[PDB]
Design a protein around this ligand. Structure first.
Ligand SMILES: Nc1nc2c(ncn2[C@@H]2O[C@H](COP(=O)(O)OP(=O)(O)NP(=O)(O)O)[C@@H](O)[C@H]2O)c(=O)[nH]1
Ligand SMILES: Nc1nc2c(ncn2[C@@H]2O[C@H](COP(=O)(O)OP(=O)(O)NP(=O)(O)O)[C@@H](O)[C@H]2O)c(=O)[nH]1
Ligand SMILES: [Mg+2]
Ligand SMILES: [Mg+2]
Lengths: 179, 69, 70, 179
């Protein structure tokens, strides 16, 4: 079995940790706690290949910017996230996360991920986003961003409903399996 | 009736209504000074319940890391 | 002389005095708000920079210890 | 060459770091910055014995209480400090530092140290302490405390003027050299 390293980044509170815990621990973290950095492991198979996926969680919090580069070395694939219920975290994709990742992980496959897909059609979310005259991110917007920053691919998911979770990691693994 | 009698009565009423424009004037000035702080604090809290959380997490992680060094 | 009378005069100065009492109750309630907020924001500012300093130091130490290019 | 471990504790801002830096680096820290933890080394000779003194700096900040026990293992001597210009840091000797040290460092020689001796006769200090109806600590007070907590000895000093600095470490070393 092969070992591959996956690192996940993106705005704070956009769902990185819940996504990793659901996939590696089969559970959904109940309470929110800003991440410093943590490391998990998980098994997965794609195209008939056993791969041990090393999952590096990082801080989305600005205040922890200084620790992030400690996780980037020897990365095989990157999951760059934003929340579908936050257009702001989307704008931070090309404004912050992309430049940083391409500086620390040159030529490393980037999978653009849009978390909290289950909020896309949530009234409370639509109502609250309406106040700032915004609306949940549309799939087209995510795709454009993926192409714009030259990602390996785009994938939407919800750690809450589990929808898309699998696809996110099968795509990331394939990416980490290129050559 | 005599005018003097009336002018006096009208004066005891204004001075009286004036006293009600004080007790319910101060009761007023209360929300002003009470609201402007009932949120000036709750605002300074959210801002500290944030920095305090980030402080604690970093500290605990440092402990975790050094106990492993 | 004048047209002023005993009883009206007394209730008049009384209206006045009662009014002044209010002019003062205010100027005093102000300089009370002006300090309350002052000393409040004063502490609630040295209260946060305190937590912010401890946060930064712990963070930097975590980096220093973890970081290989240092 | 005998290698001995010295650990220093005491209220925050009472002078621990300046005392260690003056003695090990020959310089006086300029600006004050709360310590997380740091480590220094210094050479010393007493009773005709060569000794490499390992100096473990710790946080006086309550908020860092969690990290202190990481420094206590295998300690040969402890420097428990307070500031001569702060009666409060003195009271914290029996109220906090003593119980903690005797729990983590059973039977380890304790040298009670009173820093900032140069402020004992400073008008601004006496003036300020007067507001809280206090006064700088008196030598009899520190000695009393030393005996009360069963210290190996008492020593006063000033990292500013260098007065007593040497004695503090010659006493600590002797203590770490007992048996
Ligand atoms: N509706 C919904 N909420 C989610 C989903 N995933 C996570 N959340 C919620 O979003 C909040 C933050 O999630 P978390 O994964 O901890 O975010 P993070 O990106 O890891 N935060 P940080 O960068 O600070 O470390 C939590 O309250 C969590 O329950 C999801 O798929 N749907
Ligand atoms: N007058 C005087 N000031 C001193 C002396 N030693 C230290 N100081 C001052 O006291 C302040 C704190 O000193 P420092 O050694 O950093 O304290 P600490 O006990 O190590 N602090 P912490 O527990 O937070 O880590 C500094 O501003 C420093 O200049 C001294 O001998 N005399
Ligand atoms: Mg997280
Ligand atoms: Mg210090």
């Amino acid at each position: 079995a092969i070992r591959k390293k996956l690192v996940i980044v993106g705005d704070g509170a956009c769902g990185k940790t819940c996504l990793l815990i659901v996939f590696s621990k089969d559970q959904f973290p109940e309470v929110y706690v800003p991440t410093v950095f943590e490391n998990y492991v998980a098994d997965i198979e794609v195209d008939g290949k056993q791969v041990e996926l090393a999952l590096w969680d990082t801080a989305g919090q600005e205040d922890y910017d200084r620790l992030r580069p400690l996780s980037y070395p020897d990365t095989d694939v990157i999951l760059m996230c934003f929340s579908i219920d936050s257009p702001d975290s989307l704008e931070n994709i090309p404004e912050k996360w992309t430049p940083e990742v391409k500086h620390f992980c040159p030529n490393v496959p980037i999978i653009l991920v849009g978390n909290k897909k289950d909020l896309r059609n949530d009234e409370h979310t639509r109502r609250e986003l309406a106040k700032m005259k915004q609306e949940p991110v549309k799939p087209e917007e995510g795709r454009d961003m993926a192409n714009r920053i030259g990602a390996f691919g785009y994938m939407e998911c919800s750690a809450k409903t589990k929808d898309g979770v699998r696809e996110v990691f099968e795509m990331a693994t394939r990416a980490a399996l290129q050559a | 009736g005599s005018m003097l009698t009336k002018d006096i009565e009208i004066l005891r009423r204004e001075n009286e209504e004036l006293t009600e424009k004080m007790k319910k004037a101060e009761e007023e000035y209360k929300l002003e000074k009470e609201e402007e702080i009932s949120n000036l604090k709750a605002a300074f809290e959210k801002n500290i319940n944030t920095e305090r959380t980030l402080k604690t997490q970093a500290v605990n992680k440092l402990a975790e890391i050094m106990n492993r060094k």
